[PDB]
Amino acid sequence: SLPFENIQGDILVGMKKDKEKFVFFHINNATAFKSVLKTYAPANITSVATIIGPVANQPLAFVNLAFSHAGFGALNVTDDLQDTAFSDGQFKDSPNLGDDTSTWEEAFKGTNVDGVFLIGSNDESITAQYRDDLNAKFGDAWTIVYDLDSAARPGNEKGHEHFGYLDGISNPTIPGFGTPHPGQAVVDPGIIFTGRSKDPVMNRPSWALDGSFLVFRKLKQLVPEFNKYVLDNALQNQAGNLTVEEGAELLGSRMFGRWKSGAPIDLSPDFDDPALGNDIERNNNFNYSHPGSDLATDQTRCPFTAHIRKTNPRDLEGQGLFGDTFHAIRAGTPYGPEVTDYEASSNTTTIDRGLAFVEYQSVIGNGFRFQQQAWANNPRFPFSKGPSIQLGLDPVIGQGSPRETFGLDPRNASESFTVPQVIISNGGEYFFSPSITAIVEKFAALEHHHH
Ligand code: HEM
């Protein structure tokens, strides 16, 4: 069993707070920075145990902390983690993601970002308080280079991302941690936590035990553009009696793999079933297999290129073509206000909004990076399908090539959809979230005891 009082809570369970502030910073004075850390971190870095334990022992805001490769250097900590993406930094790595850095937030366009504080609470007043407190204690020892507020959407769209789809449904868990939901992935702890069982870096340093790599991406979303696209390309059933609005929601469900309620189209392909989508016990219990259906050719229930089927090809893994290597935990939060009447009427975005995307994994190259580059951006993934069956890009997040996706029309797998870019990367950075002791014992090391 893992020491959940030593593991940063946002990795495994998520902060699950309505408001999440991301404080990206540069380190100006390592000695003064470590000094603050020595007392701040044991008092404020929120553990898994605190998040899942009694509400009585929870602070007003949860706080997590992660460092970039550049931050390691600024703290005189050797990067011996053996993660090539992490060491490169996301800006250098960005061509491999299909990013055009002309759309990046300026603060990310380099290696100036040394780390990030995650602050989760129920009111932006409290996250601002915790930020102000950090500013007061660090003083001139740091500079906040980017300060991003994210918030869960309001009302019955709480838990949904800005396109309207229920999010945070499918994430892996580990053996012995609570009860897995039907269809939920149960992966070896070393796929999420560095140094734990079946960590693919068998060489992993001891101090890194129970850390994880935090990938951050600011992903801007063009919601009216997306809505106008699916309306303009609305699908039809064989009966031919779908309205344009009904065919548009069908097409959206085919792009994602789920209806907006969360109902997986593999279980409910013809119409939304909001009771299914909302039910934790039903909404993830699928693997794309069906009696009488050829996994190699049948896209009538879910296109091979649907977002969730690109990023978690359950059928390929379930056939044993590979293992649980490529699962990772998402813990991001939507950012920006709701779509305004003007934006909707004009089919045009005027306000920045999107997803403050966070994904945790023991190997960046096996989680986020593989899901993006090897799968979403790969026009010949998934492999093992019929040799003439055209595939193309993930129609939600796929980039790097012409955004052509096949198989979205259930009546004609051959029909191509050229989907406008509705998600624009504003960049981010790769970080490492150490264990809580590692924060104090390594990153805040004030003396020079030899080892
Ligand atoms: C604004 C950007 C994005 C949006 C709106 C979005 C939306 C969604 C939605 C609605 C789901 C289904 C809910 C769920 O299964 O939990 C989902 C699942 C998922 N997404 Fe995304 N996503 C975005 C970016 C990304 C990126 C960049 C990656 C990885 C490179 C990714 C990987 C995944 C994974 C692994 C799942 C779970 C699939 C499964 O286990 O079946 N997403 N996403």
Numbering used by the authors: 58 to 508
What's the paper's own text on this?
Dye-decolorizing peroxidases (DyPs) represent a novel family of heme peroxidases that use H2O2 as the final electron acceptor to catalyze the oxidation of various organic compounds. Unlike the crystal structures of fungal class II heme peroxidases, such as lignin peroxidases (LiPs; EC 1.11.1.14), manganese peroxidases (MnPs; EC 1.11.1.13) and versatile peroxidases (VPs; EC 1.11.1.16), DyPs exhibit a unique tertiary structure: (I) DyPs have two domains, composed of α-helix and β-sheet, to form the α/β barrel structure, which is vastly different from the α-helix-rich structure of fungal class II heme peroxidases; (II) the heme molecule binds to the C-terminal region of DyPs protein. In addition, a conserved acidic amino acid (usually aspartic acid) was found in the heme distal region, which is also different from the distal conserved histidine in fungal class II heme peroxidases. However, unlike H2O2, some sterically bulky substrates, such as anthraquinone and azo dyes, are unable to gain access to the heme cavity of a DyP, which means that the oxidation site in DyPs is more likely to localize on the enzyme surface.
